[PDB]
Symmetry: C2
Subunit: 166 residues, 2 copies
């Protein structure tokens, strides 16, 4: 068992897991006759087949008791999944690199500053949304289609991680 280090979310640090949806440090160009800044293609929705559809949902999640014992992680082998804060609240993210099974020693914890969303690449292991506030709203963009799009992996007792935010 080991305690996760809560790292500030950044494009460079999160690169192996997906994309960071934010305006800070992001490229853009002008549109609407120069009245709007378009921070273009911060993330791309990936699907297994072109027949698949990208859908938009809203998740209203309640906080989990902390410290949290990370007992499992899930992945979507057939599509990406994006979470974007709607209320400006910071939130937590737990992920592990792609692989047949998430490697406990490679698990990472990130903290969004409230103005950052994330898009988990297809196959990336991650924990169900972890809010900091008692209740929070997230805009979610993911894949809709046939087949298996959710693998769950439960760590052994010794492989469990501890998330202790302060």
């Amino acid at each position: 068992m080991r305690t996760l280090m809560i790292e500030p979310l950044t494009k460079e640090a999160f690169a192996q897991f997906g994309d960071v949806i934010e305006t800070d440090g992001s490229d853009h160009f002008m549109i609407n006759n120069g009245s709007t800044m378009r921070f273009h293609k911060l993330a791309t929705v990936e699907t297994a087949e072109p027949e698949d559809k990208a859908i938009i949902s809203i998740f209203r999640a309640d906080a989990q008791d902390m410290p949290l014992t990370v007992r499992m992680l899930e992945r979507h082998p057939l599509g990406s999944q994006a979470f974007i804060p709607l209320l400006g609240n910071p939130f937590l993210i737990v992920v592990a690199p792609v692989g047949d099974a998430p490697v406990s020693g490679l698990v990472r914890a990130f903290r969004s500053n409230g103005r950052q969303g994330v898009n988990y690449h297809r196959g990336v292991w991650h924990h169900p949304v972890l809010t900091i506030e008692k209740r929070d709203d997230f805009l979610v963009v993911d894949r809709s289609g046939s087949g298996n799009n959710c693998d769950e992996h439960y760590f052994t007792e010794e492989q469990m991680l501890i998330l202790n935010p302060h």
Copy 2:
């Protein structure tokens, strides 16, 4: 010139133009051990070709001078386009039903309560983002691909409309 009636945004009134992305009055089911409410598939991203990709961007738009003279509308013939407020600010929406050209007499104006986003269906005529605050941020989900995905139609002088929120 006709002065537009600013109507409150609702699913039923906006149905001809697209979907309203909100939790109020929307269906949902529980996930994550009953800790999260999933307001499922509030909108579906539609594309024209299988090679097309759904992308996520952020628009930082400046307010337009009011009263505003509506003299054009745009449409995306190859895909849908969704706008979701990120700062919880209400905003204005101007649309017209599908057709070779936007019909002035059918143009409608809506006002989001700040907790509502909108997804313009493919082919629906709409006006470039109209913020109420001096500056505002929106999460945008739309189609990315080859071809022409933007038709801008300018109204004649007598077809122009007036948007006067004050």
